[PDB]
RNA sequence: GCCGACAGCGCUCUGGGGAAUUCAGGAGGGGAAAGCAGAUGUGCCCCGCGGCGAGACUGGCGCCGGACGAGCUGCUGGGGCACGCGGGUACGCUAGCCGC
């Protein structure tokens, strides 16, 4: 802690100030195209990608854009930060039990 | 882990905390160079501890001519018990960077519990010190008044002239 | 107590943000609720920052029992309404030159007015400051900017050039013959055409070859518009039916039954959820877009309806033979029923100047009138949105926000292939 | 009541400054194509990660003459690297002065088996010759080793312990050496009882004190403990196993690159399935190195490449080659997790950066939210199937490209034998690694 | 410049408050408007590069009589379960962006003392001050309200500390130490007060102590009379007074300074039959001392100052008064 | 120094110059703390992990190690309490019961 300075007490010699008063201190219609278009058939997913399991989780859980346009800063910050934060120095392996 | 590092200049110490340290593998790569080029990258890495000026140029006619040597000042000794840590060696150190190795060796002497890194043997607070040293004029300017290029010639001339003895046996004019 | 009010706050954040219905609910199990987690304060911090924005929209209100909101004069507006804008209500007398077709950018900020005898002319309009008059002799069929102010293409009578910010002619485009209308696509770079003889072009603007073309069955065109939201294009074919197209369906790709004679003017709105068209038959009717519904018994016109354009806002403009009306609430998209409006608001007065295009100024309050004697500009208090934002759209860009901007476009260039009805597909079995 | 609305350029630029104020509206009315642009963000993010993609900083200076054989790091520095080529010459370099070697000497004969650095600053080398204990820093230079060991056998591997001076060397005998420096003369001798083949190389666990890992050429990797002096556990798998190396961040997951072309992620205190299977390789694996923040992986192969892997990726985030890397037998971290450092058998020593495209130094924020916006969108678009294609591919040799190949249609015959010789629940391809686990 | 972005997230983080300021019926909406619009212009104005304290401490008094006005508006109103806490650490957000970017303005530092003072942030109101005696090691002024507030709070021991490396910093004005013999027989006060604390001899050991030093004068031994001359219902008083006369009689004997404390040393241990007595005394020290080869001029300008400053005192002899007057006539 | 034919050569051509201004770009200098790497109000008490640290024992070989500990402090490790205005006990002050 290089907080709020501690007491000197002995070991921070300084001037006769500090050794002598320390001294003292402690001397104290509508026709719909319904065809499939062939053209937007490779901006679609060819599959379930694998940790999920039905198309409503998957599509349902892209449903909000991950931008500056669209989102507030605050969960533009809190939605594009990696999960693994690595600063720079030594990483040793762990030393006690965290929890 | 360099924790803070000490810069000495003609207008007093300054000691900066360092947080986002330096690339010590990476020290040579180009990028690495602009991140210690230009102000508002280096400028991330260090903050401003502390800063100490002299109270007289004769202080720092003292002080250079103490540096110089190697050794420090009781000012100096005072100013790192302000802002390092009260720290043996035991269970927690701190390291310090220092430009000067034996003033390194008497500062750990000093101080039981800094470890200081000097900037003759390690490139990694060499270079995190330098750059200190480029930008040193906008990273003290909010505190000192005036600019630096003077004081460093009055103590320039103070520290010739005491060095060689010049004005009491020169009087030509 | 007051959490039912929260929950309230919750159902409009969730409506107008949440962009999608919920996540229905091992590991998966964990990872979506703090997706949901994160997706819930997501939406719940866009409505909280809703309250930052700068500027509200305007308005006029019957303050009387009498007094009502189609009888209020220009006159009464200029004087009781604030300077700035009571200079942007300004008139410009151009009669020698032919009817005076008008587009603006789409930050407002310049407007081309295309007279049919030649007269192309793009200036900043609040500045005055004329930045072209070509002069281009023979005909001209329609003038429109290109994703900038700096480049803009008019459709001539045979080919269809396109020219720099000086009026300086870069290139004739040759493969368009006969262009009768134009709207550019700017999400793409993406000009496209209608021709007289029923023929789509799609260009890219960047790259500058023609990406696709496609020849419409329907006869001779007569109307054309594009759908902001969808990229999708809406031509209007006299057979009576709006046929709605795309660069990738040779077919048409959904065409509505709108009116019996042919449909003469269309408009969309900029949100994409309803449209609006009129005929020689001259009801002018509405549409739910996305449902494909024609939600409001349909309303008349004086006269077939040579222009109609809709706002940032529910103020539609319907320009009708000599004079013009705006429509203040055709489609409430909050309401599930749509009811018939009973009676316009601000009508712009016939005085013997047939009205060739309306336009509506995107983020101001006004609306540029396009009549054979020239540019009219004429002030309405509720159109224009009043927020933007300034990463997508500027009404005050520098040239260092317009290099920016141009350089993020082009980097964001959507394909041509990318254009559906339902734009968020991307990412679906 | 007639109000305009009315702007004036003072919310453009209050009057006074020259902060371009920017007022923003997020109602999506006014920005379409969410999930397209949105799209054509994330194809520019793989078409830069792609493009950007320059893994190879540079090599250790002047390297070795014969093939690098064994190197090793200071887990208490981060530039104390060590490696011993083909020659028994040992060197010493400095991560920030990578032009020449600190220090140099022609330790062994034969070659370096096992190199370590110990809690101090003195490093450690195995070779048939047996042991040395060596001082690289001392002011003077010492040429000449300051202590040695014989009593055992041919020694093969070595490796330290974390906090306490003490270090294990895999025998020939079978056997593993307890030294505790400055007061033991001969080690404490731990093997399994009736045991006789090559003990291949051998691990200190670094979280928990007192758990050591071997490998033996008996294609069986073995457990000890060393509270209480006996063998643990022993499992025989169905290949020779080439390295071991632990968790830094769990106390009880081990990685084994094999000869099975696999590295093979096991837990420690249940020996019956396998927990990952990263299946990449090409020739034979000789280096596995855990990332020091756990999750990320390294293996060198006998072939001429080095696989970045995760944890839990099952197939490899990225590949490394050269024409001037030959076989790389050791890959190793440095002490951030942010670059990879190769032997090989070019007699050369490479450092590569883990994260190809990434670059180090301080960023602005724009650079790194950036960088980091377009690491989320990927995490979004990755399986789309353009980004997928151009983020999947890579340039991989000649011989390395013929071999998978041949690889993936030997497999193929391979796995349709083996579905008809079934056909005329199932094991699952976890199970079909641990062969036998003896008590 | 991004000073739209970061000025973004400020004011995106001051939103929801304005929130329930709407919600609640406090404000309302086009007070809300102005209240937006003003915040936004000092978000700019504060992140924007060519910045001043003054423009840190405008802000900072204007979002604080925000919190009043609020405060004020909420008692009217009679709301309670709104709160000033986002306000105040907001505050403190300013301020430590203030400090980050002009460290070397005691402005900024004293007053953000006083605001994490009157919002009783004590601990916090330490850590600040550290930070400001590190950056101003040589300003009396924050030694000597670091030691003062640590002794009214009550901690002497950390007061002690604050003064003990404060007299070891600034050794140029005898200023600190005169604070610290103030301060410490502030507390000796204290202690005789509440009756080490019998003896008493730390401000002695300034005293001899503060010999040494650069700035150890005559003058500057009149202010350390001037500080121990108060307090005269102590112990060990005349004990203190007479070793600083003694000791400048011993080591300045020919000063205007010596005579002068020679002249007001019983008036020490006064406040009465004793008061026209000890003046009467220091009449008799008077005669002797002005008559005394020294700087004749400085002892009477001081004389002067001291005749001049009884004056202010009741119940004495108009004889005295009037013959004090016509002694400052005389010299 | 102006003018300069023929022959020859080079540059350029909505011919060639000069100025005024409007627009589109490019390069360079100088100035600017130029610093959004993980953005959680304050204060007290109990727990948990840890740091300084007086003082005290011990094992092995002149050292290295164990394991005690008054006191003081950190903690974004988490939980429990309090925070606005009144009159009282109490003021160069706000500590403390009952209310608004």
């Known amino acids: 802690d290089a907080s709020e300075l501690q007491p000197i007490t002995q070991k921070t010699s300084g001037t006769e100030l500090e050794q002598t008063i320390l001294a003292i201190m402690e001397e104290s219609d509508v026709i719909i195209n319904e065809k499939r278009v062939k053209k937007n058939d490779k901006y679609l997913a060819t599959g379930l990608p694998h940790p999920f399991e039905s198309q409503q989780q998957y599509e349902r859980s892209l449903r909000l854009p991950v931008g500056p346009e669209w989102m507030t800063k605050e969960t533009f910050q809190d939605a594009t930060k990696p999960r693994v934060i690595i600063k720079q120095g030594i990483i040793a392996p762990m030393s006690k039990p965290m929890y | ?173 | ?429 | 009541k007639i109000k305009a609305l009315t702007r004036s350029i003072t919310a453009q630029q209050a009057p006074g400054s020259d902060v371009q104020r920017a007022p923003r509206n997020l109602a999506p009315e006014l920005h379409p194509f969410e999930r397209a642009r949105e799209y054509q963000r994330a194809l520019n993010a793989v078409k830069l990660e792609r493009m950007f993609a320059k893994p190879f900083l540079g090599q250790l200076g002047n390297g070795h003459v014969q093939g690098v054989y064994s190197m090793c790091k200071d887990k208490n520095s981060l530039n104390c690297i060590a490696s011993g080529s083909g020659d028994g010459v040992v060197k010493v370099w400095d991560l920030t002065t990578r032009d020449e070697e600190t220090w140099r000497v022609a330790a062994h004969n034969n070659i370096v088996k096992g190199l370590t650095f110990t809690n101090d600053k003195k490093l450690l080398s195995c070779a048939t010759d047996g042991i040395k204990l060596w001082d690289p820093y001392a002011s003077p230079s010492n040429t000449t080793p300051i202590a040695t060991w014989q009593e055992g056998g041919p020694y093969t591997s070595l490796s330290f312990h974390r906090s306490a001076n003490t270090f294990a060397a895999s025998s020939g005998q079978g056997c593993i050496r307890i030294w505790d420096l400055e007061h033991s003369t001969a080690g404490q001798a731990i093997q399994w009882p009736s045991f006789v083949d090559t003990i291949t190389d051998v691990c200190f666990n670094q979280v928990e004190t007192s758990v050591i890992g071997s490998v033996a050429t008996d294609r069986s990797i073995i457990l000890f403990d060393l509270r209480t002096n006996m063998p643990v556990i022993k499992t025989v798998l169905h290949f020779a196993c080439n390295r071991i190396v632990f968790n830094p961040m769990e106390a009880m997951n081990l990685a084994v690159a094999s000869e099975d072309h696999n590295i093979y992620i096991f837990d420690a205190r249940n020996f019956d399935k396998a927990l990952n299977i990263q299946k990449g390789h090409v020739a034979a694996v000789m280096d596995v190195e855990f990332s020091p923040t756990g999750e990320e992986l390294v293996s060198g192969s006998y072939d001429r490449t080095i696989r970045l892997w995760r944890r839990d990726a099952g197939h490899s985030r990225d590949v490394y080659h050269t024409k001037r890397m030959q076989r790389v037998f050791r890959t190793m971290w440095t002490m951030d997790s942010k670059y990879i450092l190769t032997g090989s058998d070019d007699g050369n020593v490479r450092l590569w950066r883990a994260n190809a495209s990434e670059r180090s130094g301080v960023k602005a924020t724009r650079q790194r939210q950036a960088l980091e916006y377009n690491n989320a969108l990927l995490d979004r678009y990755g399986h789309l199937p353009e980004i997928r294609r151009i983020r999947r591919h890579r340039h991989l040799p000649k011989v390395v490209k013929k071999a998978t190949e041949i690889k993936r249609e030997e497999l193929a015959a391979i796995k349709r034998r083996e579905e008809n010789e079934r056909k005329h629940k199932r094991k699952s391809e976890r199970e079909k690694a641990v062969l036998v686990k003896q008590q | ?331």
């Open chain 3, 1 to 429: 107590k007051a959490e039912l009010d929260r929950i309230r706050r919750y159902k409009q954040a969730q409506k107008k943000y949440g962009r999608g219905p919920r996540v229905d609910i091992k590991k998966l199990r964990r990872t979506l609720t703090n997706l949901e987690n994160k997706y819930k304060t997501a939406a719940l911090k866009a409505k909280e920052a809703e309250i930052l924005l700068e500027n509200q929209t305007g308005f006029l209100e019957p303050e009387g029992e009498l007094e009502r909101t189609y009888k209020v004069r220009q006159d009464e507006i200029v004087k009781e309404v604030a300077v700035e804008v009571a200079q942007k209500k300004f008139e410009l007398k151009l009669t020698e030159l032919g009817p005076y077709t008008c587009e603006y950018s789409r930050n407002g900020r310049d407007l081309i007015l295309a007279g049919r005898k030649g007269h192309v002319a793009t200036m900043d309009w609040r500045e005055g400051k004329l930045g072209c008059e070509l002069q281009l002799g023979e005909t001209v069929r329609d003038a429109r900017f290109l994703h900038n102010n700096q480049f803009f293409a008019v459709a001539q009578k045979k080919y269809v050039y396109i020219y720099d910010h000086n009026g300086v002619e870069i290139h004739c485009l040759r493969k368009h013959v006969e262009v009768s209308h134009m709207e550019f696509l700017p999400y793409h770079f993406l000009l496209a055409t209608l021709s007289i003889s029923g023929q789509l072009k799609y260009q890219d603007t960047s790259t500058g070859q023609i990406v696709a073309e496609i020849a419409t069955k329907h006869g001779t065109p007569v109307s054309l518009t594009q759908n902001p939201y969808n990229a999708i294009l809406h031509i209007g074919q006299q057979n009576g039916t709006v046929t709605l197209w795309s660069p990738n369906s040779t077919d048409p790709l959904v065409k509505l039954l709108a009116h019996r004679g042919p449909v003469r003017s269309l408009a969309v709105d900029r949100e994409g959820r309803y449209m609006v068209s009129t005929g020689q038959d001259n009801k002018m009717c509405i549409w739910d877009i996305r449902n494909f519904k024609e939600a409001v018994n349909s309303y008349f016109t004086r006269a077939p309806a040579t222009s109609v354009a809709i706002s940032d806002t529910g103020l539609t403009a319907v320009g009708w033979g000599t004079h013009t009306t705006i429509w203040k609430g055709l489609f409430n998209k909050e309401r599930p029923v749509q009811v018939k409006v009973d009676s316009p608001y601000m009508t712009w007065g016939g005085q013997g100047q047939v009205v060739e295009r309306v336009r509506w100024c995107p983020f101001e309050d006004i609306l540029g009138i396009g009549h054979n004697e020239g540019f009219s500009s004429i002030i309405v208090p509720g159109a224009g949105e009043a927020n933007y934002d300034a990463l997508e759209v500027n009404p005050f860009e520098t040239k260092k926000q317009r290099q920016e901007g141009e350089v993020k476009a082009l980097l964001n260039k959507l394909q041509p292939e990318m254009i559906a009805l339902d734009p968020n597909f991307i990412g679906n079995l």
């Open chain 5, 1 to 331: 410049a991004w000073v739209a972005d970061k000025a973004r997230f400020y004011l995106e983080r001051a939103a929801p408050e304005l929130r329930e300021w709407e919600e609640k019926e406090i404000f309302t909406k086009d007070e809300i408007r102005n209240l937006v619009a003003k915040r936004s212009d000092f978000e700019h104005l504060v992140l924007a590069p060519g910045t001043k304290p003054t423009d840190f401490l405008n802000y900072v008094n204007w979002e604080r009589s925000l919190d009043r006005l609020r405060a004020k508006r909420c008692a009217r109103l009679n709301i309670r379960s709104v709160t000033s806490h986002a306000s105040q650490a907001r505050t403190f957000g300013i301020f430590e962006r203030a400090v980050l970017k002009h460290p070397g303005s005691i402005e900024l530092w004293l007053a953000y003392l006083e605001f994490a003072a009157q919002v009783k942030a004590t601990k916090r109101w330490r850590r600040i001050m550290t930070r400001a005696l590190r950056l101003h090691p040589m300003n009396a002024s924050l030694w000597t309200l670091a030691g003062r507030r640590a002794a009214q709070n009550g901690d002497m021991q950390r007061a002690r500390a604050h003064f003990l490396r404060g007299c070891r910093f600034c050794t140029r004005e005898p200023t600190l130490w005169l604070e610290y013999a103030r301060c410490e027989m502030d507390w000796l006060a204290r202690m005789e007060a509440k009756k080490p604390a019998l003896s008493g001899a730390i401000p002695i050991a300034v005293f001899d102590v503060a010999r040494k030093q650069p700035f150890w004068g005559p003058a500057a031994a009149e202010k350390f009379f001037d500080v121990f001359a108060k307090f005269g219902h102590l112990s060990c008083h005349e004990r203190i007074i007479s070793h600083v006369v003694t000791t400048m009689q011993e080591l300045f004997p020919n000063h205007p300074c010596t005579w002068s404390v020679h002249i007001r040393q019983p008036l020490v241990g006064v406040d009465t039959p004793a008061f026209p007595k000890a003046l009467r005394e220091s009449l008799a020290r008077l005669k002797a001392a002005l008559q005394s080869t020294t700087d004749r001029k400085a002892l009477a300008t001081k004389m002067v100052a001291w005749m001049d400053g009884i004056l202010a005192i009741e119940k004495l002899d108009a004889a005295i008064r009037t013959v004090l007057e016509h002694t400052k006539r005389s010299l």
């Open chain 2, 1 to 173: 882990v360099v924790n803070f590092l000490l810069f000495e200049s003609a207008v007093g110490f300054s000691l900066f905390e360092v947080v986002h340290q330096a690339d010590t593998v990476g020290l040579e790569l180009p990028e690495v160079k602009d991140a210690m080029k230009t102000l508002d990258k280096f400028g991330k890495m260090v903050k401003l501890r502390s800063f100490n000026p002299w109270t007289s140029a004769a202080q720092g006619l003292e002080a250079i001519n103490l540096i110089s040597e190697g050794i420090m000042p009781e000012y100096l000794k005072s100013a790192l018990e302000m802002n390092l840590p009260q720290t043996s060696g035991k269970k927690s150190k701190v390291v310090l960077g220092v430009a000067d190795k034996k003033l390194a060796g008497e500062i750990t002497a000093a101080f039981p519990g800094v470890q200081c890194e000097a900037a003759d043997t390690s490139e990694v607070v060499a270079a995190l010190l330098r750059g200190i040293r480029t930008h040193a004029n906008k990273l003290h300017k909010s505190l000192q008044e005036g600019d630096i290029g003077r004081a460093q010639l009055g103590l320039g001339h103070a520290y010739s002239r005491a060095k060689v003895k010049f004005s009491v046996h020169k009087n030509d004019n």
